């Protein structure tokens with residue numbers, strides 16, 4: 001939570017960079033410009049998810065360009081824990097995401113090609129033991145069920161808490177189905193750890209910086225995992241963010257992927273499941289500044305042509 005001069009010194013110290021500016025972008029981040037090059041920094045409190053930087057190494061090694069690589073510290077490292085802590089510099093990519101920038105059909109093909117490399121990238125048996133495995137935890141559903149009961153009129157509510165409690169009832173049917181379906185389809189999947197692949201676990205329009213020309217980047221590798229490829233492929237046609245829902249695009253994607261057979265059941269299951277999770281996530285939050293957003297997003301999940309519909313509409 002520091003300010004320019006503070007940060008400006010750390011970079012000059014640990015990275016050797018001579019930046020004159022270090023704005024802040026409302027774990028924190030800033031756009032620290034140099035005399036010639038712009039950077040994107042990440043200050044993260046407490047040492048966490050080191051189980052991320054691995055994959056970036058493994059991927060950069062795999063020679064996948066669509067992965068923004070960190071900048072080296074004088075110590076020749078990718079970060080600057082500085083006594084347990086953590087700093088991460090990245091060059092600055094002036095580019096909007098799929099929530100702003102639409103992918104040209106061509107670019108879609110390229111997203112197909114990189115998701116495939118990633119899905120075909122072998123994982124060091126060692127690194128494989130730190131990544132999480134898809135076990136179909138009935139956790140999430142239990143968190144949403146604990147909500148059926150949690151809706152009662154308690155004056156000690158709030159203008160915002162009421163609304164959610166309301167809207168949730170105003171859509172109880174849909175939800176139970178999402179839960180009950182995410183429950184039934186799990187009961188049709190026979191875990192096959194022999195097919196699990198290195199999946200980016202949340203690859204929606206929000207995590208693809210759609211640059212110019214014909215260069216794109218895939219980001220946020222905080223929670224990569226080993227699972228049925230459909231874990232990622234489900235986002236193609238997903239509708240997350242009220243985008244990536246045009247069927248004519250699902251084609252451009254798989255043309256850069258390859259037609260490797262797709263288990264429509266893991267695809268359906270994962271589609272209801274991610275919702276249940278958000279409902280359980282945005283949910284448990286609305287029961288302090290994100291509560292305003294966690295409800296705006298929560299409600300969009302039910303708007304025309306968004307994840308909830310696409311989940312119930314068998315368009316696979």
Ligand SMILES: Nc1ncnc2c1ncn2[C@@H]1O[C@H](COP(=O)(O)O)[C@@H](O)[C@H]1O
Nearest residue numbers: 040068090091092093094097206219220
């Ligand atoms: N290297 C970068 N350059 C510019 N913006 C970035 C960079 N990495 C991440 N971002 C921004 O941060 C948002 C969330 O990404 P993440 O910080 O990886 O969760 C993206 O929507 C981008 O707007």
Ligand code: NI
Nearest residue numbers: 060064065069
């Ligand atoms: Ni490189």
